[PDB]
Amino acid sequence: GSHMLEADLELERAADVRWEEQAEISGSSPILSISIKNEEEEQTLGEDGAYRIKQKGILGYSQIGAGVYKEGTFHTMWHVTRGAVLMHKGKRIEPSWADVKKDLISYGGGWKLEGEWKEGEEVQVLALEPGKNPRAVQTKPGLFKTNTGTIGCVSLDFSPGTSGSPIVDKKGKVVGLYGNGVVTRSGAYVSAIANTEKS
Numbered sequence: 001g002s003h004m005l006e007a008d009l010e011l012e013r014a015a016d017v018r019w020e021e022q023a024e025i026s027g028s029s030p031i032l033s034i035s036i037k038n039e040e041e042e043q044t045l046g047e048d049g050a051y052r053i054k055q056k057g058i059l060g061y062s063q064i065g066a067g068v069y070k071e072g073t074f075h076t077m078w079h080v081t082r083g084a085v086l087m088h089k090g091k092r093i094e095p096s097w098a099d100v101k102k103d104l105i106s107y108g109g110g111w112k113l114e115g116e117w118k119e120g121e122e123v124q125v126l127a128l129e130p131g132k133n134p135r136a137v138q139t140k141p142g143l144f145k146t147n148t149g150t151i152g153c154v155s156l157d158f159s160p161g162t163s164g165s166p167i168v169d170k171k172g173k174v175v176g177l178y179g180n181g182v183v184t185r186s187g188a189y190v191s192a193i194a195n196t197e198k199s
Helices: 021-026
Strands: 009-015 028-030 049-057 060-070 073-076 086-088 091-093 095-099 104-107 123-127 135-139 142-146 149-154 166-168 174-177 181-183 189-197
Touching: 009 060, 021 028, 021 135, 060 174, 073 174, 142 189, 174 189
Parallel strands: 009 086
Antiparallel strands: 009 049, 028 135, 049 060, 060 073, 073 104, 086 091, 095 104, 123 135, 123 166, 142 149, 149 189, 166 174, 181 189
């Protein structure tokens, strides 16, 4: 086999994980990214927060995902990294735990996301889309029956490459991660919120 990485997957911090009062008031608001990032250039690269995940290729970087660093653990979607080693400023990050069925993977310790969701409450997607500055979008999840209990879900209103982006309650905690596509019995595709799940 090879002793090199199968692929160069780099992390890039983009924003603080927090509730945005402006997006509560207006529906959505941009968030500050840093000198002030006027524009995101996907193809160039550049602790706690929200991160882009980019894959090097001969044309430059592609943003294939996003995720959340919290309390020394990085959380993202199994579909995004398929358990691959991540790099961040020359530091290597290793998969600690995964759950394919839930499309979740953690790196550097176990699950730390402690946002909570009850029906009727709104949340903010802190969306890191390919080619765009971070944006907070207020949304209302609906409750759904699983074949074992309940999950909250939201509409797939972002780029697939926002997968892994955090969704936050009013306490500023992460209820879960955007982009975990599930199919309903009523023919539709929605995003199943990570933690919001009972059995």
